[model samples]
Target chain A: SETNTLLVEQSPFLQSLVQQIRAYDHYGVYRTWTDELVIAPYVIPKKKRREISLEGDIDPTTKLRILCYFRAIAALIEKETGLLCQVVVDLNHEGFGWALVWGGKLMVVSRSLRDAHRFGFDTLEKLNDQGTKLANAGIELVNKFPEVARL
Target chain B: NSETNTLLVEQSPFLQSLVQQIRAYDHYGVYRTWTDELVIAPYVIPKKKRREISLEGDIDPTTKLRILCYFRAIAALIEKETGLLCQVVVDLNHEGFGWALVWGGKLMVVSRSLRDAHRFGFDTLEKLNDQGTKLANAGIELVNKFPEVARL
Candidate 1:
């Protein structure tokens, strides 16, 4: 028969908090009804929180996103040349790895991955311009070295 | 006149002036503004305080100052303890969430993601030192664990 009464039962926050405190569950435990996710807004949406590491290991989804980023670049290349392109992201948790993009096994683009966790394109123009440049560079190499590229 | 249950701010041996700016800046004065990108204000914070100052955690004026303040303070403390001067960078893009990286030997030692900058402050002196120590310890352990990775 223990009750923790509030000094100002008439006040709103206290009243609301007190009401919830007294509403015991099947375990006879009192807890705050306030949901943090509903209240707090993180820059990276709450669900995406687990997928990023500012300075440490990369996540599975992040790894996929890296491949996807390269794949997007490959997509641009394929559209121009009418040939399919492939992406290979060989990375470790340490953020030190290599990424390769192939135009028919010619090694169109190879990126030395230093910090994939902090990677992003600043703007759409930057994404398109830089991605186009990479795609163009790959297509040129495929044109120059098709004999070696095929083997 | 008396602080019954409050912690006083402590001064650092290095870059103490920059840290003091945070104190002064928090108290937005109808009076204080000056050169060297400094501002002063009169504050008589009592042991007992007000109900709410919700807006304090909103933004920064030359807000990079606060970011640099925290980054430099931590960097100083870490170097002071370890006798190694780690490179540091604090980035708060137009968006508040960003990076605070501390590195030694070109190899990254401490990488931190920070947000909610307006809420950054230490209740007491050791809080900053404690965080500095904690960061340094974590990095030292990481380096000791992987000497080879430390090269990268």
Candidate 2:
């Protein structure tokens, strides 16, 4: 059921953001022992046509798994805030793009991607509420640029 | 039945396929997919068999302003077929892959390494006047086979 609530989920930042989006589901298709975490389908039906599905079409490893799911949420916000959390993604081949997360010069987690060939999340409590709201807005902008997010 | 296949099912893709159907109402809210579309529907599709769908493999933020409106619709169909002044330029690489050109002035009339280029356009107007009469007869066969590289 909705991914066995990611092993009895009890937010340690949504149990490490669902093990960082299930290590980019190497086709376990977001496996958490039940089903559903969805990392596919922007329109994949077919017998003739309806393909699109882009991410790795951003070339290689689903565009490094969408920049490794925001560089594992900026490595769990640089392991719970020691700062320096950078991430930038910019897709295009029609999957559309833009994903940012920098922390130094403060740009904490901006995302404008579109139909990213259906990158997943149909619950795990809304992927731990949008990955704890993008790691609490990148640790509140690295706690107000803790000296430029640790320079 | 291609109104780009009913806009590829209105390309919302189950609202970004997660985050419980997108919307961010706060903290610099911009991760959108939520829709209300204040549309007051009327005169639905009939403007002379209406044509202008602009979405095939949908993704927006104006998808680079729809590739600058398909480079102004093929530079106004290659300036009404080589009466000249063409410039439908493009060089893509934000994964939209790349290559495009039609240029014409000093001549580079149609180069086309053309990759997905956000799935380009012209789903019809008879393929935009059959791709502007095949690049206006290949820019008049490069102005009659390299007339000084089509006039220097």
Candidate 3:
């Protein structure tokens, strides 16, 4: 852990889906699009287009290619390198996306309206962590169902 | 008009076609196959009959396309704005790439080879002018195909 490996990783990028789940807090729906993926509401925005940012080289032209490489690497590691990881992504409905690196894989999580209660505007750290967890869940759910891979 | 303007023009990403031709000398004899718009460097060591080199994606989108486009754009400006019935040809080789102007049965100017044409610390205009005069005196009378420049 102290090695500072300089490894590159991308979490999930969830945006539109967070809109639906923010209202209900008691029974959060867990949709598994793949066997190794999952997601939940992380927070709510005070205003429209609120965003939590991550630090890395991600641009429009490079986004798709980066994410694809992340997926292929994770899948290959599990199959070839015998490493299991869970990855997730979340977009605060903002300009850019945040990701969660778990078990070496990724998923996209949607922010919910109800999760807004847990958010504190004063702390940048808290908001970032919340975004990361949501993305983690989203990625986990996606990896749960193999059939969803086609869609 | 002055040294500063000359430096600015040479360093500017928006170089004229003549400028590009001279700059291209940096790539000469480096690669067996050349790509138009890619930033490339050749390896110094030998892999087989030829020294192997690596070409990688440039941070710039397309340097070749930009260089060619500058020529075409300048050609249009010469015809429309300057009204100087001039034609420019940019030729690149290992020794250097250069630009020449053809008009009034005279081809008296060429932007000098890049080796003599850096933007800083030296006056390159004189050298470029000399190259142009040499070509003009040679009386090649090559067709100054300004129209075909659009195909670039």
Q: What lDDT score belongs to each candidate, Candidate 1 first?
A: 0.49, 0.48, 0.31
Across A43-91, the per-residue lDDT of candidate 1 in tens digits comes to 1343465455666677655565556556756665666666666555655
Candidate 2 wrongly placed segments (more than 4 Å): A1-18, A23-60, A78-88, A91-99, A102-106, A109-141, A145-151, B1-54, B59-152
Backbone collision tally, model 2: 3
Superposition TM-score, candidate 2 onto the true structure: 0.25
Model 3 lDDT per residue over A42-100, tens place? 22344531443334333332333223323433443344324444333322223244322
Complex DockQ, candidate 2: 0.01
Q: Give the C-alpha miss distance for residue A40 in model 1, angstroms.
A: 39
Top candidate (DockQ): 1
Q: After superposition, how far is residue B119 of candidate 2 from its true place, in Å?
A: 14
Candidate 2: tens digits of C-alpha lDDT, residues A54-125: 435444455565666677677778777867464556666566766666543344565678756555455445
Which sequence of candidate numbers ranks them by lDDT, best first? 1, 2, 3
TM-score of 3: 0.18
lDDT of 3 by residue, B1-152 (tens): 46654554445332333444434545455423543222211101133422222223221223333333334434433344334344433323223233322222121112222221111111244433343334433322222332222111
Docking band of candidate 3: incorrect
Give the per-residue lDDT digits (tens) of candidate 1, residues B27-142.
45522354222221112222233122233433564455566655655555555555555555554433556556655443345657776544445443445446655766676664
TM-score of B-chain for each predicted structure, in order: 0.53, 0.27, 0.28
